[PDB]
Structure 1
Amino acid sequence: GARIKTLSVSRPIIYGNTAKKMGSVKPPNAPAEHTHLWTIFVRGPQNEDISYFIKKVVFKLHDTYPNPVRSIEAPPFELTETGWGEFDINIKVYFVEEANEKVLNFYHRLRLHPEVSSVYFDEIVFNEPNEEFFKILMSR
C-alpha cells in the first residue's frame, strides 16, 4: 500500500564530554584549585561536517565561570575548559537560517570522575522541514 504521511528527516548527532585529570602543568590563566581539563562537544559521526545544517552551538556553563554562556559560531562545535566539579550544561543548537527552526535545547551532565568520557549517539528528527532546508539536508 501507499499513504501520505507527515514528512520528517533524521540526522545522527554525537554530543557529550571527555575529561582529564591534570598532571603537573596547568593552562595559563586557569584557577589554581581546578583539578580537571574537559571538553564539551557536538559533532557528526566519523567527525563529518555538521555545519551545513548547524549554524552555531552555545554551551551554558555553571555560573561560577566567567561569561558562562559560551557561543561557538564555527566548527568544531566544542569548548575546552578547566574545572573541579561536575555540573549540568545547557547545549543550545542553532540551525542554519533557512531551516526556520527554534533553538534545539538539551542537557548534559559534565562527567569528570570515573580519561573519562560521557558521550551520546542520538538522532535529530526534523518534523516538517521546508523545501529550502530539505535541499541542504539532502546536500549530503
Structure 2
Amino acid sequence: ASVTIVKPIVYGNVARYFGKKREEDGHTHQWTVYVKPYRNEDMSAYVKKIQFKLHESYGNPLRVVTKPPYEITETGWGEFEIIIKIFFIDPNERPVTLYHLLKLFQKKTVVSEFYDEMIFQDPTAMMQQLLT
C-alpha cells in the first residue's frame, strides 16, 4: 500500500464477582466487554457501529453500540467467545473482526485485555481525513 494508517486498540472484558451464585438465575458476575482506542482519540469519528455477539444462551445475543463507550455490560455465569465486529463509516472499508474469550475467574476484580491494530491500506481521501 502507498498509504498505511494504523489505529491501535485494546479490547477484552472486566468481571466483578458477586459474593456468591445469585439464586434467581445462577449468575455469579457482572461483566463489561469493550473496545477502546489504545491512546486518547474519538473512534466515533470513523467507526459506524461495533457489534458484540454473545453466547446463544442470551435471549438477545447480538448487541450493537454506535456511540462511545463501545461496551456492553451484562451479568452471567458462563465463559465463552464473544465476536466483536467493528464497522467503519466508509462502506469501502472491510469490517474488523475480533474474538475474545470472556473471563470471569482468575478474585473480586478480573481484567482480560488484549492489544490489536486496525490497519487501513490506501483508504479513500474522505476516510484518510477522518482517520487523520
TM-score after normalising by structure 1: 0.84
Q: From 16, 21, 25, give the equivalent of 2:17.
A: 21
* Per-residue deviation, 1:6: 2.6
The residue that corresponds to 2:83 in the other structure is 90
* Per-residue deviation, 1:136: 0.8
Letter matched to residue 35 of structure 1? T
- Residues 99 and 129 of structure 1 are in contact (CA less than 8 Å); yes or no, is this contact kept in structure 2? no
Structure 2 residue 78 is matched with structure 1 residue 78: no
**Aligned-residue RMSD, C-alpha:** 1.9
Structure 2 runs not aligned, ≥5 long? none
CA deviation vs aligned residue, 1:80-113 (integer Å, no higher than 9, x gap): 00010110000010111x3621221120000011
Query: How many residue pairs were aligned?
Result: 129
Structure 1 runs not aligned, ≥5 long? none
CA deviation vs aligned residue, 1:50-87 (integer Å, no higher than 9, x gap): 11111111000000001100011211110000010110
Percentage identity across aligned positions?
43
- SS in structure 2 at match of 1:51: helix
The residue that corresponds to 1:104 in the other structure is 96
- SS in structure 1 at match of 2:55: coil
Letter matched to residue 118 of structure 1? S
The residue that corresponds to 1:69 in the other structure is 62
Letter matched to residue 10 of structure 2? I
Give the structure with higher Rg (CA).
1
Distance 1:86 1:121, change over 3 A: same
- Residues 6 and 118 of structure 2 are in contact (CA less than 8 Å); yes or no, is this contact kept in structure 1? yes
- Residues 35 and 70 of structure 2 are in contact (CA less than 8 Å); yes or no, is this contact kept in structure 1? yes
* Per-residue deviation, 1:46: 4.3
Find the aligned partners of 2:11 and 2:79 in 1 and give their Cα distance. 17
- Residues 14 and 43 of structure 1 are in contact (CA less than 8 Å); yes or no, is this contact kept in structure 2? yes
**4+ runs of 1 displaced by more than 6 Å?**
none
Structure 2 residue 111 is matched with structure 1 residue 117: yes
Find the aligned partners of 1:52 and 1:99 in 2 and give their Cα distance. 14
TM-score after normalising by structure 2: 0.89
